[PDB]
Amino acid sequence: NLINVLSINERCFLLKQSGNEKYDIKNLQAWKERKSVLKQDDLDYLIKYKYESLDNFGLGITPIENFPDKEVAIQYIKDQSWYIFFESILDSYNDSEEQLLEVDASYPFRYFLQYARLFLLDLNSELNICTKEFIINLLEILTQELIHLTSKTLVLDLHRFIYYLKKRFNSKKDIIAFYTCYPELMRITVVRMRYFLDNTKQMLIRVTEDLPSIQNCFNIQSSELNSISESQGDSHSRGKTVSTLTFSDGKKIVYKPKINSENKLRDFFEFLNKELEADIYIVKKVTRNTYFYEEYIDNIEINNIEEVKKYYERYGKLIGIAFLFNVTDLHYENIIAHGEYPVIIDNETFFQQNIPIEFGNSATVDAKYKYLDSIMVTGLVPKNTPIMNNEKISFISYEKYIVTGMKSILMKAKDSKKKILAYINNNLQNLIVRNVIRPTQRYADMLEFSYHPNCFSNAIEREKVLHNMWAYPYKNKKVVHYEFSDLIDGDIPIFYNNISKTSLIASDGCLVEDFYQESALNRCLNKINDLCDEDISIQTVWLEIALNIYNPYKYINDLKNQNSNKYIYTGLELNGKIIQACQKIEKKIFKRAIFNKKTNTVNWIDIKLDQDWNVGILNNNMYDGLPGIFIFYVALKYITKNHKYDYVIECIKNSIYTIPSEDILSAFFGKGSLIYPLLVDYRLNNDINSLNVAVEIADMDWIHGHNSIIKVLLLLSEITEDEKYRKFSLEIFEKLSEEPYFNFRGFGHGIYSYVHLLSKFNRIDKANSLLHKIKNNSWCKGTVGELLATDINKTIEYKNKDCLCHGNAGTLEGLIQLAKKDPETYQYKKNKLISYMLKYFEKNNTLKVAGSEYLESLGFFVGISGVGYELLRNLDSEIPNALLFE
Ligand SMILES: Nc1ncnc2c1ncn2[C@@H]1O[C@H](COP(=O)(O)O)[C@@H](O)[C@H]1O
Numbered sequence: 001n002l003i004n005v006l007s008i009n010e011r012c013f014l015l016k017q018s019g020n021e022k023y024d025i026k027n028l029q030a031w032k033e034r035k036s037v038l039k040q041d042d043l044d045y046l047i048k049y050k051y052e053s054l055d056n057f058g059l060g061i062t063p064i065e066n067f068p069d070k071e072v073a074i075q076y077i078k079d080q081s082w083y084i085f086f087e088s089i090l091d092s093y094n095d096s097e098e099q100l101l102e103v104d105a106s107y108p109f110r111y112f113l114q115y116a117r118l119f120l121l122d123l124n125s126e127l128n129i130c131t132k133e134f135i136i137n138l139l140e141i142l143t144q145e146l147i148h149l150t151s152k153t154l155v156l157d158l159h160r161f162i163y164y165l166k167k168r169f170n171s172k173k174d175i176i177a178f179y180t181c182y183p184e185l186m187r188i189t190v191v192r193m194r195y196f197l198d199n200t201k202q203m204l205i206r207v208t209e210d211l212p213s214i215q216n217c218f219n220i221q222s223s224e225l226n227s228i229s230e231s232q233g234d235s236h237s238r239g240k241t242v243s244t245l246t247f248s249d250g251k252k253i254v255y256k257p258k259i260n261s262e263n264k265l266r267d268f269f270e271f272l273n274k275e276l277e278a279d280i281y282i283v284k285k286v287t288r289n290t291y292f293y294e295e296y297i298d299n300i301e302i303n304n305i306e307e308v309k310k311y312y313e314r315y316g317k318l319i320g321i322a323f324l325f326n327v328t329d330l331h332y333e334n335i336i337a338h339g340e341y342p343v344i345i346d347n348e349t350f351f352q353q354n355i356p357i358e359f360g361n362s363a364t365v366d367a368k369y370k371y372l373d374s375i376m377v378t379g380l381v382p383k384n385t386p387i388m389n390n391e392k393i394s395f396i397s398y399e400k401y402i403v404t405g406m407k408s409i410l411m412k413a414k415d416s417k418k419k420i421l422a423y424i425n426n427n428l429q430n431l432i433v434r435n436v437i438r439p440t441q442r443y444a445d446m447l448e449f450s451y452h453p454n455c456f457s458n459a460i461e462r463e464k465v466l467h468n469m470w471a472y473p474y475k476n477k478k479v480v481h482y483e484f485s486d487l488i489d490g491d492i493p494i495f496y497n498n499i500s501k502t503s504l505i506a507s508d509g510c511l512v513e514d515f516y517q518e519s520a521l522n523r524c525l526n527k528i529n530d531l532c533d534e535d536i537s538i539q540t541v542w543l544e545i546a547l548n549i550y551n552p553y554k555y556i557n558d559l560k561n562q563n564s565n566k567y568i569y570t571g572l573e574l575n576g577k578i579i580q581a582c583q584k585i586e587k588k589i590f591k592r593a594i595f596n597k598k599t600n601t602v603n604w605i606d607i608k609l610d611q612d613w614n615v616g617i618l619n620n621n622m623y624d625g626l627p628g629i630f631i632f633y634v635a636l637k638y639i640t641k642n643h644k645y646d647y648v649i650e651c652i653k654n655s656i657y658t659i660p661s662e663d664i665l666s667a668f669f670g671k672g673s674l675i676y677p678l679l680v681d682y683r684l685n686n687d688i689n690s691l692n693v694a695v696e697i698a699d700m701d702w703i704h705g706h707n708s709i710i711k712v713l714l715l716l717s718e719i720t721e722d723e724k725y726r727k728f729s730l731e732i733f734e735k736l737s738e739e740p741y742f743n744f745r746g747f748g749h750g751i752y753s754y755v756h757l758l759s760k761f762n763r764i765d766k767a768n769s770l771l772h773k774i775k776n777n778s779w780c781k782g783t784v785g786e787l788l789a790t791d792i793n794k795t796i797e798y799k800n801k802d803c804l805c806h807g808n809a810g811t812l813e814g815l816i817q818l819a820k821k822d823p824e825t826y827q828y829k830k831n832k833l834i835s836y837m838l839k840y841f842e843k844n845n846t847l848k849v850a851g852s853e854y855l856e857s858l859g860f861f862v863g864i865s866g867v868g869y870e871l872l873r874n875l876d877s878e879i880p881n882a883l884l885f886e
């Protein structure tokens with residue numbers, strides 16, 4: 001069975017050498033149809049670059065006994081370094097059974113364990129650097145590795161436990177029998193064995209050589225290692241693992257056998273402490289070329305509440321620092337709370353770049369990049385909790401201090417651009433950092449699957465299980481060859497990067513050139529160079545949202561606007577003030593616009609509400625999405641000008657047409673929300689095209705319900721004469737019950753929207769019957785709702801909100817109406833409201849809407865696009881009343 005250890009390439013080679021090439025073909029078909037997530041392109045990639053061709057692969061897949069020249073294949077296997085090493089381990093073993101530990105289930109590996117023990121004894125007799133306890137610990141670690149590796153195989157190799165171990169593993173040949181039964185388990189076992197011996201020997205030689213520096217740096221009096229522990233299953237670069245080492249005086253260091261730049265990082269942190277008052281805890285290290293030793297950092301108790309505030313401020317600072325220098329993979333679980341200091345113990349992932357995954361080329365995926373450029377990607381934003389009187393102190397009621405910590409770092413750094421940029425260029429151009437290009441858990445899962453008895457019975461089978469790695473959407477898949485090589489080798493893949501280059505350094509030191517397009521160094525220089533108040537502001541929002549302390553109105557509530565200052569504008573100068581205000585609104589919108597020059601698309605990042613407030617990208621819903629901004633530019637075009645706004649309205653149409661949206665039958669949410677604004681675009685400007693698109697969509701309680709969609713359907717009939725729509729809505733309205741979906745008393749979220757439909761479906765009087773059987777201020781609930789469907793001074797009063805949905809612009813629609821029905825009573829009150837809104841606009845340089853500084857809601861119903869729209873309607877009533885869709 002030994003020939004089953006052969007890999008596809010190895011099988012392919014021997015067959016060619018056997019004077020053979022015509023492979024069965026039938027088993028290629030048997031392989032080609034198996035459950036796989038590999039797409040055709042993936043398969044094409046793998047077949048060509050891992051194997052020469054599809055023929056070779058077909059040849060390399062030949063099963064067991066169908067194999068010619070078995071002896072010459074066996075001789076090939078027996079010539080392999082790992083096979084020879086397996087022989088030596090078997091032949092070296094000794095009959096005695098009285099020295100090595102009896103805490104068992106490790107019976108199967110006693111051969112490996114003894115061989116490891118004698119190797120370690122011989123080594124220490126030379127080095128004199130550890131004790132017998134330490135060697136005991138080392139063997140437990142090897143034992144646990146072999147246990148874990150072979151366990152899945154054990155459970156099925158059955159088909160009280162000591163009986164099977166006694167039986168199945170009793171003699172030399174009987175152990176050879178189990179390993180020849182699973183010859184891929186045998187190969188990897190010996191591979192892991194060799195790694196274990198080499199890494200331990202290498203470790204012990206390093207500690208012996210580095211000892212005077214270790215003693216001096218860490219104030220350790222002892223000259224002998226006594227204990228090794230905490231060896232996480234996370235191994236890299238030929239079985240290398242982090243370990244905690246305890247000396248015979250009880251003092252501990254952490255051994256990290258990793259490529260590193262710890263000396264540059266220390267000088268960097270010191271710079272940051274001086275320049276940015278970063279107050280980073282500097283962890284003591286003895287740094288060497290391809291490894292380092294680190295100070296053992298424990299979770300020491302914090303003394304008082306005054307220190308807890310300091311702790312969480314410092315935490316906010318670390319977040320600011322992580323943002324500024326593109327830190328990823330930090331993980332807030334893993335911070336060590338060292339008294340009043342949060343301590344990072346892994347800092348190998350500064351200066352990162354986005355993984356070159358495949359994404360579309362729209363403005364709306366480019367908009368996704370700004371999240372990947374935020375505080376959220378650092379790993380630091382929710383042994384890591386401070387502890388006071390055996391009590392864990394979470395961030396609850398300390399959120400404020402984290403926010404302040406972060407803000408102060410970002411503000412100070414903004415003022416220190418040139419010093420930061422000069423440091424980086426002076427000291428860090430060749431920084432080597434790690435890149436996690438695929439999450440560890442994915443790699444871990446893959447490895448476990450590859451440990452299936454079926455993978456261990458036939459290398460070919462293990463190889464195929466790993467073939468799945470080729471499914472991942474890397475732009476450059478040349479990297480997967482290296483992941484595969486770590487994983488068959490039994491390791492988690494690991495990659496490094498010099499921050500000024502665009503290549504990846506693979507686990508064996510090989511380069512993958514042109515992996516990145518821009519260097520990590522430049523990405524950070526620019527972020528630093530470009531750092532502005534707007535960025536600080538959005539990072540504060542992200543954070544406050546994450547800490548669950550975001551207030552959508554905090555920003556407007558905290559403005560000081562005085563009492564008796566500024567007054568009512570005259571008819572003529574009020575028109576001049578409206579246009580200026582709409583230009584201010586447009587410009588606020590454009591400044592936050594994300595353009596993609598390539599596809600002529602645009603999108604925005606904005607704070608939006610969906611049960612909670614979250615930062616998001618604008619999608620196709622009327623309430624707070626892209627149709628909102630669309631209709632506003634439409635209206636602004638109706639006046640003037642063509643230029644500027646043409647090359648933006650196209651971009652907006654491109655996005656709305658071509659993004660993940662619904663087919664839903666609704667006038668809010670999904671492509672069905674695009675109807676009205678397209679009709680309005682048709683009715684105000686020429687554009688048949690918007691009407692063309694408008695009709696295409698149509699073929700497929702007011703908010704959230706159907707009421708609104710019924711209403712726009714009627715608009716369609718009207719503009720196209722085609723009564724297929726009026727009947728469409730009739731059907732829906734006939735089954736639509738009389739009770740409102742919500743108990744509120746308004747339009748959109750109450751009974752008044754239903755009312756309006758009846759007086760559109762001709763059937764008045766019976767509309768008045770509901771108006772009869774019942775007998776704040778907003779359009780959505782409240783009286784402006786009631787007003788527009790059909791105590792005036794209450795409903796027309798100024799409020800400290802400006803939006804359409806439940807603010808002054810909605811009130812302004814009520815006034816626009818009343819002042820048409822009765823100019824003498826209302827034309828002045830109307831101009832009063834407009835003037836108050838414009839005056840506060842001017843003074844505050846913002847409108848009274850949800851959001852934060854530099855980040856006003858952009859939406860139609862709660863944002864500034866609707867306010868601009870309403871203001872424009874006042875200038876020309878040809879702009880229809882969107883509030884009830886006309
Ligand atoms: N300098 C250190 N002090 C204390 N514990 C550490 C240190 N470095 C690593 N560890 C621990 O060892 C494990 C991490 O190894 P690594 O992921 O390579 O940093 C975690 O469980 C840490 O708690």
Ligand SMILES: [Zn+2]
Pocket residue numbers: 778780781805806
């Ligand atoms: Zn509302």
